[PDB]
Structures are given as structure tokens and as C-alpha cells.
């Protein structure tokens, strides 16, 4: 009925905000570019999604052999695990803020709690989606209010000139850069769209002029990604206007935002706590939906590469568990350190953006053969190659 959808994923949340607590308005440009890129990529897969009656996974299978198949399957599994780790940490932090339970108990609750999603499914969709949409929209209103006196030409002229010296030299910059990119693309979204397009009442083969569906779907996808771009830009400039030009250059993870909202002077006293807990709720809900979307993606991947299948609850459970193991390892090793956990989170995102090319290459290749093809694949070519140079340099400086 009414509009309801969740666009903020803790990955992009932390990455964008961090990018505004440390370096300022510099990263802004990168965001745009990444967003634009994803648009194009969506387009591509959707074309592949609608013709050739296959899924990107099946595609990969039809250009490989058994072993390298195992390899790319490992890679896709690792991408999914990365996203799930991001999510579970998001949920754990949300719980620790709202209630007070320590992190380990929250992590365990999250991992073996998927029964909530069968319960609430038996409960009713429209209401829950409406209410979460309301709360997210309101949280975003709050952030907008919170942004204050600012100098536009700064943001602008830093968006534009793209100080390459800057964007490449600070190897702290490449880090959050790759973070933003790999959190704006999210390969699991690629596989999932490739599959989901396969069902829109197009006359599967008996309409050579089904491309009307292509145009409609691409329009939808572009609208979606555009609004995601606006949200990311907002979060970044928020981190900027709330932590920049200061002493000790506090990192700017989640906790710091949660406090800065509370102790915020001009917001009175109680309103601090009000917005605080609202933010907490938002974090939690975003985590959960980001989980639920990717289960189908994992299923599709395994069905494609190994040509095997499992019921969903087993899939979700085992993935979540193998995801939560690194969380607990890091917690016990580093005895609990918000700084250390948020650093793990960002490293997860950047690892996602490292894995991307192994799933980007075959997409381009396959769209170079069949009946429908892009005229200027050259954009994707330059994209992947510049990409490879960046990732290998960031690897090298280690």
C-alpha cells in the first residue's frame, strides 16, 4: 500500500560517516563516481538478466571448469560472509546501546535468532514495513536538522577538483575510498538482480520486443540508486559538520555519533536521549533487513556454481554462524574495544570491494558475446583496470 523500503545499510553508514569525521569533504567526489558506476553495472546485468535465460552464476559455470568453479564459488561465499559480518556487528552495537547487555551476548542472540523473522512473517508485512519506513524517514529528518552553519563552496570545490595527490597519497584515504565503493556496489546485489529480473511477465522468448521490460526495470533501478546516492552524500557531510577541524580527530564510528547526538547542547537535554534511542532503533532495523535480502543471493550462488541446493533456514544459519566466528575471535582477542570492532567492520567492507573484480570480469565478458551488447563497453574496461591498479597498490603498501 504505502511506501516502505530500507536503504541505509550499516556498511555504507559507517563508511560514509567515517569519511566525514577524519578527512572532511575530500572523499565526497569518490562517492558520486562509485554510485554512477553501479548504475551502469545494474544496466548490464539486467540486460543479461532478461535474455539468455540464465543467471550470472550459471554464466560463470559455462565459461569454467570444476576447479576454477570451486575458486569463484569460494570468492562469492566470502563476499556474502563479509556482508553478513557487517550486519551482525551492526545489530550487536545497536543492542548494546539501547539496552546495556555486553557485546558477546548480543552477538550470540543475533546469530541464533532468525526465528523472529518467521514469527513476524506469520504476523504481518504491511504494518512492519510502514513503521520501519516511518522511523527511518524521521531519523533522516533529524540528521538534516542537525546540520548547521556551513560553507558551500568548500564542499563544492572539494567535490570537483578531486585532489589526486590527496586521493592517492594518504593510504588512509584509499582505505575509506575502497570502503565506500565496495559498500555502494555490493556484488550480492548483482547476483540477486540478475535472478530477480527473470520474472516480470515478459514473453520469455516469444517477444523479441520485450526490451520494454528492460527499459522499465532500468528506470526503476536508476531511481533506486540515485536516492541511495543522495543518502550517502548526506551521511558524509554529516560526519564532516559534526567532527571536523578539531583536536584528537576522533575517529567517528557509531558510538561517537550516538553520544554527540545526546550531549548536543542546542537540542536541549531530553531531546538528546530521544533522538539517541531513535537512532538506535534505526540501526537495528537496518541491520535486520540487510540480512534478510541476501539469503536468496547465497542460495542463487550455490545453486549456480555447485548445482546443488538446500532449504533456506539451514543456509542462513550456517552462513550466519561462520560469519559470527570472526566477531567473537576479535572480541576475545582485543578484550572489547569499540575502536577495534569498528575497524573490523570497515575492513570487512574493503575486503568486499577487493573481491568485486573476480565477479565483475565475467559479467563484461558475457555481455560481449550474445545478441544484445553495449556499444561502449569501454567504460567498464577502464573501470576494471583502474580498479585493479588501486586495489593492488593498497595491497602493496602493506
Amino acid at each position: 500500500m504505502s511506501v516502505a523500503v530500507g536503504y541505509m545499510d550499516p556498511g555504507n553508514w559507517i563508511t560514509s560517516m567515517q569519511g566525514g569525521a577524519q578527512y572532511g569533504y575530500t572523499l565526497l567526489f569518490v562517492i558520486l563516481i562509485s554510485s554512477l558506476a553501479a548504475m551502469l553495472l545494474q544496466s548490464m546485468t539486467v540486460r543479461l538478466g532478461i535474455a539468455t535465460g540464465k543467471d550470472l552464476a550459471q554464466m560463470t559455470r559455462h565459461f569454467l571448469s570444476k576447479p576454477v568453479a570451486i575458486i569463484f564459488w569460494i570468492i562469492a561465499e566470502l563476499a556474502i560472509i563479509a556482508t553478513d559480518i557487517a550486519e551482525v556487528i551492526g545489530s550487536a552495537i545497536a543492542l548494546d546501546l539501547i539496552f546495556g547487555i555486553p557485546l558477546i551476548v548480543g552477538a550470540l542472540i543475533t546469530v541464533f535468532d532468525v526465528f523472529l523473522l518467521l514469527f513476524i512473517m506469520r504476523f504481518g508485512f504491511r504494518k512492519i514495513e510502514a513503521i520501519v519506513g516511518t522511523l527511518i524517514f524521521t531519523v533522516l529528518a533529524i540528521f538534516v536538522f542537525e546540520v548547521f552553519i556551513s560553507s558551500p563552496q568548500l564542499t563544492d570545490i572539494l567535490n570537483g577538483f578531486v585532489p589526486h595527490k590527496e586521493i592517492v597519497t594518504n593510504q588512509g584515504i584509499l582505505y575509506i575510498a575502497l570502503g565506500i565503493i565496495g559498500a555502494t556496489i555490493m556484488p550480492h546485489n548483482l547476483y540477486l538482480h540478475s535472478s530477480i529480473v527473470q520474472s516480470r511477465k515478459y514473453d520469455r522468448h516469444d517477444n523479441q520486443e520485450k526490451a520494454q521490460a528492460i527499459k522499465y526495470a532500468t528506470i526503476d533501478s536508476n531511481l533506486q540508486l540515485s536516492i541511495a546516492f543522495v543518502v550517502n552524500c548526506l551521511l558524509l557531510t554529516l560526519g564532516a559538520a559534526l567532527f571536523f577541524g578539531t583536536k584528537t580527530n576522533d575517529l567517528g564510528g557509531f558510538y561517537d555519533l550516538y553520544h554527540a547526538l545526546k550531549t548536543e547542547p542546542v537540542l536541549g537535554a531530553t531531546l538528546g536521549g530521544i533522538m539517541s534511542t531513535l537512532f538506535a532503533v534505526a540501526l537495528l532495523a537496518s541491520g535486520q533487513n540487510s540480512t534478510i535480502t541476501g539469503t536468496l543471493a547465497g542460495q542463487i550462488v550455490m545453486e549456480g556454481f555447485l548445482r546443488l541446493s538446500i532449504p533456506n533456514w539451514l543456509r542462513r544459519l550456517i552462513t550466519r554462524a561462520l560469519a559470527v566466528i570472526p566477531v567473537i575471535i576479535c572480541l576475545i582477542i582485543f578484550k572489547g574495544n569499540s575502536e577495534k570492532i569498528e575497524q573490523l567492520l570497515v575492513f570487512s567492507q574493503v575486503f568486499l570491494s577487493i573481491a568485486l573484480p573476480f565477479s565483475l570480469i565475467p559479467l563484461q565478458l558475457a555481455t560481449s558475446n550474445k545478441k544484445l551488447m553495449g556499444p561502449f563497453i569501454n567504460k567498464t574496461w577502464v573501470n576494471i583496470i583502474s580498479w585493479t591498479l588501486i586495489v593492488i597498490l593498497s595491497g602493496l603498501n602493506v
Partner: nanobody
Amino acid sequence: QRQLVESGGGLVQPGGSLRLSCAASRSIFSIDTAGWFRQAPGKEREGVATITRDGNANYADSVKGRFTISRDRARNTVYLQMNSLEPEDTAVYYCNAAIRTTVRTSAQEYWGKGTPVTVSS
């Protein structure tokens, strides 16, 4: 120097354990650097531990093995868990801090009032 409130001291047999908790009075943004001092009744204010901005947990040279400082970045509260206590650790345990009220105001010191801790049969 007020607006900090330690709490948790109490009688304890030799070899017991307990967790003192420096705190804040109202809605404090962050605790830069803590420190727990001791002022046993016939000596000078010694000093027992020191966390830093991120983490350093530097200790004294007579306590490593029993005292585990920590922080709680969620509800700003330094902790101090003493384990396997001894009859030579009786004293009042002050707390130091480096409170910073809001995200842009400079730092500012603060001392506590401290709490007693007795160890005996």
C-alpha cells in the same frame, strides 16, 4: 573537584575480588584518560593504573597480575577489577579523569572523592 562518583568499595576477605567503577555525573561525551590512585592511611597518593585515549592499560610494578583496568565506551565509565586481594591493598581508591563535555570544547581535569576498601578476616 566533584561531579565524579566512584562506587563499589566494601569489606572483602583476603583473596576476594571486586570491581570499582569511576563514573560521570550527567551525560558526558567522552573520557580521554583515566587513572586510579590509592592513598592508604600512612603513605602518599601512589597511583595504580592508567588507560589512555585508545588503550594502554599501563600498570604499576607491584600490581600486574591482579588489576585489570578497562573502559566502557557505551556508558562512559572506567572500570577497575581487582582480583585475589591482599591485606596490603587496603586504602581509599581515588579516580582521575580527563572529561570533555561536548564534541568541540577543550578537555578539562576532574578528581573524584574515592571509596574505601578493607581487606581482613
